[PDB]
């Protein structure tokens, strides 16, 4: 039986539990920096397009 069509949302508090510091604050900052560095896709959009352009022109 399908669920495509075309009450209140709650949290399972016991599930959430079951899943500050100068060391932990440092660990968080390192992660945030790693993540910022990793997400660089915005830098290469133009190049990606120029690559799609000229490979189209091969035909």
């Amino acid at each position: 039986k399908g669920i495509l069509k075309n009450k209140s949302q709650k949290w399972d508090e016991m599930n959430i539990l079951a899943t500050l510091s100068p060391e932990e604050r440092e660990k968080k900052r390192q992660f945030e920096m790693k993540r910022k560095l990793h997400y660089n896709e915005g830098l290469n959009i133009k190049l990606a397009r120029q690559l799609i352009s000229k490979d189209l022109h091969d035909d």
């Binding site: 669920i3 075309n6 949302q9 959430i16 790693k34 997400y39 830098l43 959009i45 990606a48």
Partner: protein, 295 residues
């Protein structure tokens, strides 16, 4: 004529194996999957209205073995219903297995299995971040072109029982009415700015008031009050999105009114994060199933 039961069977054959074992489908099967799924996407709404119960997953980024871990935990289709939030390809080693299994399940259970579009389901990112190279190494450029056409037709957002809004990225400064989503025509590429860009690119930010600059260099950040106003205005309870690796697989924002889900543990051999999947039961009670990082 395309044998879906065979394709699923062969893709699932590697279930017990050492991570990284390839499944080699024939070229014509892969493009069979693309052409048939494209049809199903175009035939269903661009803004999905869905009923609970269902499992919601975030980014997977070619981590096929981890996708199999998710189904093991949540139950293989059709034991459970699934909504994925996008970003199936790139970054990982096995984009093709990942997308093929997902597209196969979409074709076999078109009303119990759902895929949204992520920012990596777009040629402007695909060319560069692994998928194209995968396609050209194992098949040819032409196959990548076929996937592009399929991706261009993916739905963009979902509302679960009128209470949970789901998209890959987040809100848009241009999102005033749900009808604005419904109006987007497919097939379509992702524009450099505007509503469709934002839905796939934006991020929540603790330190921002209203709408701010995004470090990605595309789209925006939004603050907690923005999330609060949106839920209030459209009479919703929760925003569910993906798009950013988080350490525990999931992370709350704005007093639990938004949650970020990320389903790839040990993300691309560069992080040691958990992956999470969210379970939504019939009463909309939400719980989290974690894939812990390797030890």
């Amino acid at each position: 004529k395309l044998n879906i039961d065979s394709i699923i069977q062969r893709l699932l054959e590697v279930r017990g194996s050492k991570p990284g074992k390839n499944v080699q489908l024939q070229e014509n099967e892969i493009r069979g999957l693309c052409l048939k799924s494209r049809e199903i996407f175009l035939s269903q709404p661009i803004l999905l209205e869905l009923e609970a119960p269902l499992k919601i997953c975030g980014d997977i980024h070619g981590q096929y073995y981890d996708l199999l871990r998710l189904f093991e935990y949540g139950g293989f289709p059709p034991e459970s219903n699934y909504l994925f939030l996008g970003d199936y390809v790139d970054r990982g080693k096995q984009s093709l297995e990942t997308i093929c299994l997902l597209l196969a399940y979409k074709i076999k259970y078109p009303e119990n299995f759902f895929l949204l579009r992520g920012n990596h389901e777009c040629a402007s990112i695909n060319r560069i971040y692994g998928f194209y190279d995968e396609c050209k190494r194992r098949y040819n450029i032409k196959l990548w072109k076929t996937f592009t056409d399929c991706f261009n037709c993916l739905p963009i957002a979902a509302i679960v029982d009128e209470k949970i809004f789901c998209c890959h990225g987040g809100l848009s400064p241009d999102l005033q009415s749900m009808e604005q989503i419904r109006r987007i025509m497919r097939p379509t590429d992702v524009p450099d700015q505007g509503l469709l860009c934002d839905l796939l690119w934006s991020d929540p930010d603790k330190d921002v008031l209203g709408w701010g600059e995004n470090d990605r260099g595309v789209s925006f950040t939004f603050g907690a009050e923005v999330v609060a106003k949106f839920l209030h205005k459209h009479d919703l309870d929760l925003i569910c999105r993906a798009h950013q690796v988080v350490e525990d697989g999931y992370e709350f924002f704005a007093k639990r009114q938004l949650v970020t889900l990320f389903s790839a543990p040990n993300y691309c051999g560069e992080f040691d994060n958990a992956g999470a999947m969210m379970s939504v039961d019939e009463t909309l009670m939400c719980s989290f199933q974690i894939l812990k990082p390797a030890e």
